[PDB]
Amino acid sequence: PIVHGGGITEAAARYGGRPEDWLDLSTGINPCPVALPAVPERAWHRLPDRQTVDDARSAAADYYRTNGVLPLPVPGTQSVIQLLPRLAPANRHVAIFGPTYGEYARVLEAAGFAVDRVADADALTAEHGLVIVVNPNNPTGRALAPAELLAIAARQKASGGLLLVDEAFGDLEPQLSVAGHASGQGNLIVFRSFGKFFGLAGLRLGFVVATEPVLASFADWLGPWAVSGPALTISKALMQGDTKAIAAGILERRAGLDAALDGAGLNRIGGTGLFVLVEHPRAALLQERLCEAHILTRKFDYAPTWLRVGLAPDAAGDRRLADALARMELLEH
Amino acid sequence: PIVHGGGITEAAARYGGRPEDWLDLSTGINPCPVALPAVPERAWHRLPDRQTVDDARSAAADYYRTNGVLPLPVPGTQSVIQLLPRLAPANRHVAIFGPTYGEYARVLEAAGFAVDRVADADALTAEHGLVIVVNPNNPTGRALAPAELLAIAARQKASGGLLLVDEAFGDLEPQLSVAGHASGQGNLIVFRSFGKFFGLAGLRLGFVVATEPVLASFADWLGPWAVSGPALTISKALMQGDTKAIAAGILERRAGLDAALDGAGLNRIGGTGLFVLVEHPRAALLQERLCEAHILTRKFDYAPTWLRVGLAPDAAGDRRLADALARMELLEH
Numbered sequence: 001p002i003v004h005g006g007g008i009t010e011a012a013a014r015y016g017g018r019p020e021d022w023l024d025l026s027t028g029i030n031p032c033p034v035a036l037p038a039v040p041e042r043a044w045h046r047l048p049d050r051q052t053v054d055d056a057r058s059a060a061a062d063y064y065r066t067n068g069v070l071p072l073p074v075p076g077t078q079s080v081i082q083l084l085p086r087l088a089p090a091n092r093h094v095a096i097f098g099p100t101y102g103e104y105a106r107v108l109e110a111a112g113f114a115v116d117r118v119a120d121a122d123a124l125t126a127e128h129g130l131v132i133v134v135n136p137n138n139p140t141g142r143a144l145a146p147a148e149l150l151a152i153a154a155r156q157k158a159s160g161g162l163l164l165v166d167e168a169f170g171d172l173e174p175q176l177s178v179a180g181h182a183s184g185q186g187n188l189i190v191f192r193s194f195g196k197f198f199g200l201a202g203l204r205l206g207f208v209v210a211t212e213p214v215l216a217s218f219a220d221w222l223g224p225w226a227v228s229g230p231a232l233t234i235s236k237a238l239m240q241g242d243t244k245a246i247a248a249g250i251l252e253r254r255a256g257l258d259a260a261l262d263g264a265g266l267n268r269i270g271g272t273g274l275f276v277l278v279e280h281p282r283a284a285l286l287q288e289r290l291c292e293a294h295i296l297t298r299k300f301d302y303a304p305t306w307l308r309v310g311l312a313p314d315a316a317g318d319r320r321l322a323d324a325l326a327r328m329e330l331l332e333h
Numbered sequence: 334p335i336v337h338g339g340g341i342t343e344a345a346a347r348y349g350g351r352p353e354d355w356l357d358l359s360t361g362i363n364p365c366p367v368a369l370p371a372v373p374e375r376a377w378h379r380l381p382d383r384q385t386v387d388d389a390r391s392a393a394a395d396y397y398r399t400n401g402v403l404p405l406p407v408p409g410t411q412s413v414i415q416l417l418p419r420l421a422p423a424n425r426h427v428a429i430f431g432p433t434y435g436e437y438a439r440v441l442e443a444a445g446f447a448v449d450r451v452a453d454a455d456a457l458t459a460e461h462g463l464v465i466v467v468n469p470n471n472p473t474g475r476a477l478a479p480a481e482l483l484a485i486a487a488r489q490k491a492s493g494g495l496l497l498v499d500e501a502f503g504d505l506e507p508q509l510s511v512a513g514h515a516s517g518q519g520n521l522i523v524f525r526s527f528g529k530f531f532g533l534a535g536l537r538l539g540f541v542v543a544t545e546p547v548l549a550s551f552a553d554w555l556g557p558w559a560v561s562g563p564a565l566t567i568s569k570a571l572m573q574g575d576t577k578a579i580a581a582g583i584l585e586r587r588a589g590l591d592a593a594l595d596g597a598g599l600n601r602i603g604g605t606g607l608f609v610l611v612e613h614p615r616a617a618l619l620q621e622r623l624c625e626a627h628i629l630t631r632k633f634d635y636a637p638t639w640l641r642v643g644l645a646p647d648a649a650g651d652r653r654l655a656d657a658l659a660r661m662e663l664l665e666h
């Protein structure tokens with residue numbers, strides 16, 4: 001399997017300490033979780049009712065500005081990633097803009113698809129029945145403009161190709177979103193994530209924006225009661241609340257992280273509101289040394305000079321990171 | 334799709350009333366939800382950690398008496414039903430003891446398997462690569478003894494067949510369970526459900542008990558972070574608590590339902606602690622008339638004389654049902 005960010009259990013087992021003493025900078029989750037809305041006993045007790053679902057879907061249509069399309073709630077983005085083998089044309093390649101989140105290639109290659117890693121729209125052909133872009137990208141933060149994405153979609157449509165845009169990290173940049181273009185474009189699918197922006201990744205919740213035939217396919221494949229009642233209640237309440245304050249809080253924490261990393265002499269080469277990509281010639285060794293300080297960060301086997309650093313919850317965490325960098329022992333083995 | 338129990342949204346739309354005024358007797362959920370344990374902010378905020386998972390798995394191993402096998406948490410039983418097409422031998426039939434929960438046949442036939450409906454172990458052959466028994470059965474409550482199940486498993490093993498036992502309704506009858514026999518039997522898989530017994534079906538949580546190769550297959554197919562952090566926290570706490578009082582409460586509510594149904598002159602032909610199966614020559618019309626009283630019950634297109642009635646939450650609900658039966662208008666259209 002892929003070693004995703006968030007592995008505090010394994011890190012604390014390997015490097016010591018109690019998990020709650022660790023500073024976890026290895027994910028892209030909002031470090032300051034929004035306050036929980038009320039969840040009535042009924043929502044805990046009953047199989048999730050159609051009304052609970054529909055309320056969540058209307059709230060999501062408003063929040064993601066989907067131009068009337070009701071997004072489909074799904075139990076976490078992984079659950080629909082794993083259904084992409086049923087939607088992608090089976091005798092065509094899949095083009096993935098990368099380097100990116102590795103579950104797309106893992107899932108599609110396990111299902112026997114040929115996956116082409118690409119970086120530019122210029123590498124896209126009619127052999128690509130599905131094109132995947134994480135926008136903005138994880139882990140580089142690269143952002144394609146809406147018009148580039150729609151031009152990609154239009155070019156693939158001529159051969160019956162689909163474009164999937166995973167906007168997991170797009171809540172801070174609503175002007176990049178193509179979630180309003182599903183009806184007009186026709187061959188466009190958008191994934192949205194709930195846990196990262198709202199800081200409640202303990203819930204497993206995502207949304208799909210697509211045409212009705214495609215949404216009906218996803219619904220059928222996922223089966224009844226796929227998404228928990230609490231998740232649907234919480235996302236309705238929070239999407240109807242004040243998300244501007246959430247975004248402003250995130251940007252404040254990101255300014256704090258920038259100052260810590262810059263003041264430590266590290267080279268920031270990308271990121272989003274929720275994480276920074278650092279390049280350093282001994283990045284893997286930096287990750288290990290930070291672990292020895294009980295600070296977890298994300299490294300990548302395919303990019304030995306990359307380190308992805310998520311936000312700290314407060315200025316004391318920023319300073320904890322800076323001090324660990326300043327006091328770190330030789331970067332040799 | 335199948336019209337499962339719990340459809341209060343649709344019923345209230347068709348027959349009027351506010352959903353919270355309806356008496357929902359159309360499911361098999363414990364009508365008296367257990368009190369919620371504490372869920373620390375950390376469990377809401379973080380992607381579900383390996384430690385949270387492992388704690389839930391150890392609690393489930395103790396609670397289901399699995400003889401050392403760590404059950405795999407899954408996001409609701411439907412999520413592993415939908416993976417049965419990947420586990421069943423692809424060029425063999427599937428035998429399903431029925432009439433039963435219809436998702437097994439729906440999922441397996443959608444995947445191109447030939448499904449044989451059976452009622453007796455005597456109809457089982459080597460052509461059956463997978464045999465499915467819901468035990469005790471939904472909706473009849475039929476119970477096979479552990480020794481009959483193990484004899485079925487042993488007979489299928491000779492041809493490399495698997496036996497799946499869905500013990501969704503087995504928490505009240507722990508002496509029927511074969512969840513302790515996975516290592517010794519080798520070709521046995523057990524599904525357990527969380528929402529029904531504990532009355533918290535808003536959470537989507539089940540467990541799989543199987544050999545390690547099979548559990549590792551399910552884990553890989555489900556992908557990372559499949560089960561919510563709150564669900565895993567709650568099930569650990571509640572499985573370690575006092576489940577005897579939960580069972581006793583359920584049996585009290587079931588005695589109340591029996592008295593209501595018997596005193597109304599209805600013929601009970603089966604059930605479990607969590608529901609009663611009634612036979613009546615105009616069952617479908619009874620279901621419609623109860624809907625007119627804003628009481629929802631479960632009918633079946635394949636059994637026009639069957640009505641499944643779940644528990645009411647209190648004696649006032651029992652009396653509401655009895656009065657609706659006593660005052661109901663002509664059972665003709």
Ligand SMILES: [Cl-]
Nearest residue numbers: 015016017018
């Ligand atoms: Cl230690």
Ligand SMILES: [Cl-]
Nearest residue numbers: 065066067068
């Ligand atoms: Cl809109």
Ligand SMILES: [Cl-]
Nearest residue numbers: 101134138168
């Ligand atoms: Cl991502």
Ligand SMILES: [Cl-]
Nearest residue numbers: 181183184185
């Ligand atoms: Cl458009």
Ligand SMILES: [Cl-]
Nearest residue numbers: 348349350351
């Ligand atoms: Cl009304």
Ligand SMILES: [Cl-]
Nearest residue numbers: 398399400401
């Ligand atoms: Cl045991």
Ligand SMILES: [Cl-]
Nearest residue numbers: 434467471501
């Ligand atoms: Cl069932």
Ligand SMILES: [Cl-]
Nearest residue numbers: 514516517518
């Ligand atoms: Cl045994």
Ligand code: NA
Nearest residue numbers: 228230561563
């Ligand atoms: Na949940």
